[PDB]
């Protein structure tokens, strides 16, 4: 390779490296989009489960109110 050819290759290599860094920059942003998507998805799921567990807890407390009343009734009917 001639000197002028080697320097031109140096230039091409630099330009190629910049395009490569750009593609990585693109891919990093796509990673952030995916990480935040899953982040929000797990937070919506967590919210739904949090309220479902709250509904569930109040149903249980009411259940034990009924059960203790049953017991009070069975005692009375004796």
């Amino acid at each position: 390779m001639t000197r002028e050819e080697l320097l031109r290759e140096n230039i091409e290599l630099a330009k190629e490296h910049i395009e490569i860094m750009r593609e990585i920059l693109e891919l990093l942003q796509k990673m952030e989009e995916l990480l935040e998507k899953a982040r929000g998805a797990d937070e919506d799921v967590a919210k739904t489960i949090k309220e479902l567990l709250r509904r569930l807890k109040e149903i249980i407390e009411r259940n034990q109110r009924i059960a203790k009343e049953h017991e009070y009734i069975a005692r009375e009917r004796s």
Binding site: E9, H17, L34, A38, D42, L52, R62, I66
Partner: protein, 75 residues
């Protein structure tokens, strides 16, 4: 009286049954939400995994470019 208390108890069993059925559906819905969330996270991690292997392949070429640049500087 026996008849009043027995209808009191009978009315409560109707309430309990509706509550127990409601609890059951909630647990099945919770179980499904977790399975769906796991599937969605596995999907994201699948895609993240592929993005990273592209990045690392881009760093293979980056190292090749650097390696070639040092060659040119040597002589």
């Amino acid at each position: 009286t026996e008849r009043k208390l027995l209808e009191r108890s009978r009315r409560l069993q109707e309430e309990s049954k509706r509550l127990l059925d409601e609890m059951a559906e909630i647990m099945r819905r919770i179980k499904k939400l977790l399975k769906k969330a796991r599937g969605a996270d596995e999907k994201v991690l699948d895609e993240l995994r592929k993005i990273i292997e592209r990045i690392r392949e881009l760093l293979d070429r980056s190292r090749k470019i650097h390696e070639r640049s040092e060659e040119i500087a040597y002589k």
